[PDB]
């Protein structure tokens, strides 16, 4: 069962020896992050391994990364790895391939412009107030707070109102039928018993397709397909993603059909719910364990927003230290962990031959903690992103949102969404560690970049 | 189980109603040929059906056929339908796809030039003598001859000597180890219990790949892989396909590797063994049931080749009535039956939208027996291809070797190979029907264009 396990030895590329059928997946017992760091340590700039029979070439050269992600993106490295039975979510932009992706990425790009985002801040700002009033209930009761719930409700509060206009206090209505379905849209643990079996038996993916089995629960999508169906029939002015997409199909490319439009609204929740929630928990953990950084940030917030002034789009871009705190956290915790591109031709880039079918991988977690580009990479030093030192940062080493034409389309939204939370939250509360707080934080050995234990902290009102 | 069975009704294309999972394959109980004729009768110029879940759009417009096979061949309709677990025969030119095919088709095109073919006639001519001496043994014994064996041995006699230089009287040595393996390379009956299950369960193809199961018997290819391995080690001048390919890798494209070179030699046998043998049986059946055509051909042969003169390359191209007999037979019996191309993009050709993934099919058998282009299409009238009437023949209606960049690469060889047999055979023997001869001939209801019963005829010596 080693039809292709001799490839990296033929090309003369170092890497760990694979087992038959399994490849190197037994080395995932400590997570993707630990595996990438160690391979980078042993083998250096380029190494290869096997996800079962699938060869994966890892690369850490900034020139090589720019070629893969930007230069030869359209011509060679256009798609990501197929990951399992997807059904009608083939129409989602992150899942679509080749010209279908290029068309979708164009039909949805004006939806994520800064000008469209500025019109969305009054909707995002409203649920910072909901976020604060939910926090104040737990602050004057003295109970340590579990961030992933109060923040998980916030990330859901923003999605429902900016992606459909549904206004729900999901923390005090954690039980409305619309919240039940959308909360079942968590990010995928590719080290769970399922996707590991997908890696060993990729020939089983076409099987699950003909059985209508999907990695997106059919009930959730069936609920949202008819829910959007009823929303579009009711609207027959506002700044919500669904509206901008409805306006898109109301015209070079074919207009977004009805099923394609629903599939995008679903992938926006999938890419934004647990991601936004997890980064906001990582940031508050660092603000708690470094009170000096939390105070300096609170001083800057009140300096731009006197007397707890409500944050605007412009006053958010005005806060440089807040952007430093966010950027430094995303360096330590790049929740995607990896970037992947499927090589679709036989190409030679930067003096290295890469054959068709090989998955090229950029280990983001490993590069963000590389001592050869970062001084004391484990420490939380927001000054790395000061306007003085941000020039010395290579944009292909620090890729928390990826790079190139296939980078995070919701990057501006995700950063504004997180910053509006921190501003309103730090305007009202200080965050101090608890005896039950895991210090130092340990990561999950699974397939998602998340804390081993949920981050619990103390919340005091200023 | 009808995820895509609504496609042709959405596009408004007529066709037979499909059953869940099965599609229209139950209509194959009378063969592909009967199914194409009837659909052409009911629905007209364009219709659609389903091979399970796979939509197949049939087209019969000459302008549309030229677009599919020539104009938009490289850009859209480059590949044929995937057909089952293929293994290392992915490297065969007929199986390869996209740029890999374009590269192989270039590395092998100078191998099939007329100039290379002229140097192969002395090898092909030698086994016409072997073919005659095998026929003479059965002619003066009065036994009716089964053509598919005496001709099957001839088509194998030509392949072994022109593809490897192996000189075997496969009719009197039907038992050498080299003949045993190569005779297991028959054309595929896509209506047998296997490939019908492949059509219903295409998700099972990736399964059979990981089990090393291949539609080419592993023992045969393993025998030939090491046999060619020993042939190339022994050669370390002649006009054999293996030599021309060995010369190709002895240099814009990468040279043919060792496994690719073996895979081509195998696909040449697969495409040439039963095909050449079956056409030669169809021709002799028509020469037997139309003695007037057989006499006129024998008169032309002796007029170009006096006193049973051995046929040269030039004297073969000199015989126009022989070319008429061959062409008229290939019209009645286009052994490929169909041409197929997978639509790889969303394209609109000649005012008709065709979506990505649909297999476009050209029903050759049906078009060759279309009364709207042929007068009395069932009758064997070689005068249709007379130099006077051959101008009125549309090259996209009569496609026995296909058309466009992906047509039969061995067309010139196959025609010369068959004609050299008929010349030498008609120089020595006349062929008269037997009481056991099936008159009129009935075709096999299976998935191969072949007689229902083997053609048995009487052979008398002139
Ligand atoms: C903390 C928040 C987020 C982080 C860290 C993040 C990170 C990423 C990364 C690393 C990628 C892959 C880039 C690449 O492959 O080069 C990506 C893709 C993507 N993200 Fe985000 N993301 C976040 C939030 C969001 C949000 C709020 C949206 C809202 C729509 C979103 C939508 C997408 C989409 C659609 C893609 C795929 C784009 C394509 O394939 O063309 N993400 N994200
Ligand atoms: C009576 C003899 C033969 C007939 C009727 C025949 C017919 C055909 C047809 C209809 C096609 C497909 C064309 C298309 O898809 O448009 C084809 C393809 C092909 N044939 Fe033949 N063939 C014959 C003999 C041979 C021989 C002797 C060879 C020797 C090498 C050969 C090699 C091939 C190859 C390699 C292809 C695929 C080419 C490609 O995919 O680029 N065939 N043949
Ligand atoms: C087995 C092959 C794995 C590839 C599957 C895969 C991996 C992956 O990291 C992502 C996928 C999909 O979908 C999108 C929506 C792009 C996500 C956006 C946000 C982040 C943090 C993760 C992205
Ligand atoms: C289920 C999809 C069916 C496609 C498989 C398929 C169909 C087909 O008609 C042929 C295939 C392969 O291979 C080659 C070598 C091109 C053959 C050449 C000679 C003739 C008569 C048949 C050709």
Author numbering:
A (entry chain A), B (entry chain A): 26 to 261, 267 to 281, 286 to 496
The authors write:
pmcCytochrome P450 3A4 (CYP3A4) is a major human drug-metabolizing enzyme abundantly expressed in the liver and small intestine, where it catalyzes a variety of mono-oxygenation reactions, including hydroxylation, epoxidation, and heteroatom dealkylation. The extreme substrate promiscuity of CYP3A4 stems from its large and malleable active site that can accommodate diverse substrates differing in size and chemical structure. Besides endobiotics, such as steroid hormones, arachidonic acid, and bile acids, CYP3A4 biotransforms over half of administered medications, converting them into more water-soluble forms to facilitate excretion. In addition, we determined crystal structures of productive complexes with THC and darifenacin, which helped better understand the ligand-binding process and conformational dynamics of CYP3A4.
Our spectral titrations showed that THC is a type I ligand that induces a blue shift in the Soret band of CYP3A4, leading to a nearly complete low-to-high spin transition. The X-ray structure was solved to 2.72 Å resolution and contains one THC molecule bound to the active site. THC approaches the heme with the cyclohexenyl ring (C-ring) of the tricyclic core at a 40° incline angle, whereas the aliphatic tail points toward the substrate channel. No significant structural reorganization is required to accommodate THC. One slight adjustment is observed in the I-helix, where two central residues, F304 and A305, shift away by 0.41 to 0.46 Å to allow THC to approach the catalytic center. The most notable change is in the R212 side chain, whose guanidine group moves up and orients parallel to the tricyclic moiety of THC, establishing cation–π interactions with the partially overlapping benzene (A-ring). The ligand-binding mode is further stabilized by multiple van der Waals contacts as well as long-range polar interactions formed by the A-ring hydroxyl group with the A370 carbonyl and R212 guanidine and by the pyran (B-ring) oxygen with the S119 hydroxyl (4.2–4.5 Å distance). The aliphatic tail is flexible and not well defined in the crystal structure. Importantly, the observed THC binding mode is productive and suitable for oxidation of the equally distant C7 and C8 atoms (4.1 Å from the heme iron), the preferable sites for CYP3A4-dependent metabolism. Thus, the long-range polar interactions with S119 and R212 assist but are not critical for the THC association, which seems to be mainly driven by hydrophobic interactions and steric complementarity with the active site.
